[PDB]
Ligand binder design. Structure first.
Ligand SMILES: [Cl-]
Ligand SMILES: [Cl-]
Length: 159
C-alpha cells in the first residue's frame, strides 16, 4: 500500500524476487506508484526482471499502466531489449499499439534497439508496421537511422 508500497517499488527495481513475493503475500498494493507515478510492473519491465514481472501480473498488476508521458511497461520492455518480458506482457493483454507522447509505439522502440525477436512478437500481436510517430518516423526509418542494417533490410519488405 504505502509502507509496503514503497518497499515493493524498491524490491522491483532492485531485482529482489522473493522480497516481492513476500510483500505481495503481506498485502502490498500491486499498483503502488513512486513519486514519478511509475508502478512495480513498470520498474521490473525496464530492469529485465522476468520472475518479478510474472509475480506482479499474477497479483493483478495493471499491464497497461501509463505515465504522464504515455509510456507503458511494454514500451520499456521493448525499448530495453527484454524479449521474454515483452512476450509475457502481451500474453497478459498489453496494448501493442500504445502511443507515448512522441507518438512512439513499442515497435518503434524495439526497432531502435534492433531486437528482431521483439519486432516479430509485436507484429504477431498486431503492431502496425507502418505507424508513424509525431515526427513522421516509421520503425523502418528508425532502424535505418540507427544503422540497424539487418532489421532495416527486413522491414523494407513490409513497406
Ligand atoms: Cl522508466
Ligand atoms: Cl546490423
Amino acid at each position: 500500500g504505502s509502507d509496503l508500497g514503497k518497499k515493493l517499488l524498491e524490491a522491483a527495481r532492485a531485482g529482489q524476487d522473493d522480497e516481492v513475493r513476500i510483500l505481495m503475500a503481506n498485502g502490498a498494493d500491486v499498483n503502488a506508484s513512486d513519486k514519478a507515478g511509475l508502478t512495480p510492473l513498470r520498474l521490473a519491465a525496464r530492469t529485465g526482471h522476468l520472475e518479478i514481472v510474472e509475480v506482479l501480473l499474477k497479483y493483478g498488476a495493471d499491464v497497461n499502466a501509463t505515465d504522464i508521458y504515455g509510456r507503458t511497461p511494454l514500451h520499456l520492455a521493448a525499448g530495453y531489449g527484454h524479449l521474454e518480458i515483452v512476450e509475457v506482457l502481451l500474453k497478459h493483454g498489453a496494448d501493442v499499439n500504445a502511443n507515448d507522447q512522441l507518438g512512439d509505439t513499442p515497435l518503434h522502440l524495439a526497432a531502435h534497439w534492433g531486437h528482431l525477436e521483439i519486432v516479430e512478437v509485436l507484429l504477431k500481436y498486431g503492431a502496425d508496421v507502418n505507424a508513424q510517430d509525431k515526427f513522421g518516423k516509421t520503425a523502418f526509418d528508425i532502424s535505418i537511422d540507427n544503422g540497424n542494417e539487418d532489421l532495416a533490410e527486413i522491414l523494407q519488405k513490409l513497406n
